[PDB]
Structures are given as C-alpha cells and as structure tokens.
UniProtKB/Swiss-Prot annotation:
The keyword Disulfide bond applies. It holds the Pfam family Toxin_cobra-type. This is Cytotoxin 5. InterPro entries: Cytotoxin_Cobra, Snake_3FTx, Snake_toxin-like_sf, Snake_toxin_con_site, Toxin_cobra-type. GO terms for molecular function: ion channel regulator activity; toxin activity. Belongs to the three-finger toxin family. Short-chain subfamily. Type IA cytotoxin sub-subfamily. Basic protein that binds to cell membrane and depolarizes cardiomyocytes. It also possesses lytic activity on many other cells, including red blood cells. Interaction with sulfatides in the cell membrane induces pore formation and cell internalization and is responsible for cytotoxicity in cardiomyocytes. It targets the mitochondrial membrane and induces mitochondrial swelling and fragmentation. Inhibits protein kinases C. It binds to the integrin alpha-V/beta-3 with a moderate affinity. Is cardiotoxic and cytocidal to Yoshida sarcoma cells. It comes from Naja atra. Expressed by the venom gland.
Length: 60
C-alpha cells in the first residue's frame, strides 16, 4: 500500500480502495518490474507481463 508508484518516489500512501501494490513483471532482460504501483488490475498473465501483486507493503 505505502508503495512505489513508478519507482524513484519510493514508498508512500495510495488513494482510497486501491488495494494491492502491482508491478509489470518483465522477466526477460533481468527481473525488471517495469511500472510498480498502486492501481487494481492485478492478476492474470500475458506473457511479457504477468504481475506480482503484493499486499504487504514491501515487495517493490
């Protein structure tokens, strides 16, 4: 929740019922979380972008 919305503003609070702290889980070049941050689109898997949601404020 208090969480990296983008990156270099690292960890602070998120509005309302925007629940888990998301991130664009690219595996390929290195594990490169692209965009991190609160929003709500969380689960599924594409391919270049699964997402690793996390409810404990720190995985980001």
């Amino acid at each position: 929740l208090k969480c990296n919305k983008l990156v270099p503003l690292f960890y602070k609070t998120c509005p309302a019922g925007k629940n888990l702290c998301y991130k664009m889980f690219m595996v390929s070049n290195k594990m490169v979380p692209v965009k991190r941050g609160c929003i709500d689109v969380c689960p599924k898997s594409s391919l270049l972008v699964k997402y690793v949601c996390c409810n404990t404020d720190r995985c980001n």
